[PDB]
Design a protein around this ligand. Structure first.
Ligand SMILES: CCCCCCCCCCCCCCCCCC(=O)OC[C@H](COP(=O)(O)OCCN)OC(=O)CCCCCCCCCCCCCCCCC
Lengths: 59, 69
């Protein structure tokens, strides 16, 4: 069935547009969301040393 | 014998497909309230420190002018 996105009413009512001037102006979503979800850095990366280690295979 | 094809006891437990992107509550205008607040602190303290530095300024000019003769 059809479940569609981006068809929504952006509220020009107050308390939405507050956070819209805050949003455009202060970059909170950009900063918090992105910079933090990269600050997700600390997870142990996945890398394998090919001479000394080898990836999985199948019979 | 029996058959070794895969399917286990049914269902594999539940799975969650649907989208989730929640949780930012600090944002009313009140974000402005805390930032503008921080300004309101900065101008206070900096005001004080510039006054002090003027006091020192006069004191130094007093050193010089007492020297002049
Ligand atoms: C009480 C006495 C009076 C007090 C008065 C105080 C008033 C305070 C009011 C707010 C003050 C200003 C706040 C900051 C404004 C900076 C400029 C700005 O608003 O840029 C937003 C602008 C919007 O983009 P767009 O929508 O495309 O443009 C609209 C054009 N019609 O552009 C953007 O959003 C895009 C910019 C993206 C830049 C690249 C990404 C940068 C990511 C890192 C940013 C953070 C870095 C922080 C600093 C690091 C350490 C120094």
């Amino acid at each position: 069935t059809y479940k569609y996105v981006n068809l929504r009413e952006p509220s020009m009512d107050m308390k939405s547009v507050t956070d819209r001037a805050a949003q455009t102006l202060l970059w909170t979503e950009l900063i918090r969301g992105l910079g933090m979800t990269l600050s997700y850095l600390f997870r142990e990366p996945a890398t394998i040393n090919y001479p000394f280690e080898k990836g999985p295979l199948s019979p | 014998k029996v058959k070794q094809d895969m399917p286990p006891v049914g269902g594999y437990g539940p799975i969650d497909y649907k989208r989730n992107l929640p949780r930012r509550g600090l944002s009313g205008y009140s974000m402005f309230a805390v930032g503008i607040g921080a300004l309101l602190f900065g101008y206070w303290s900096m005001m004080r420190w510039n006054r002090e530095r003027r006091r020192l300024q006069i004191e130094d000019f007093e050193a010089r002018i007492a020297l002049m003769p």
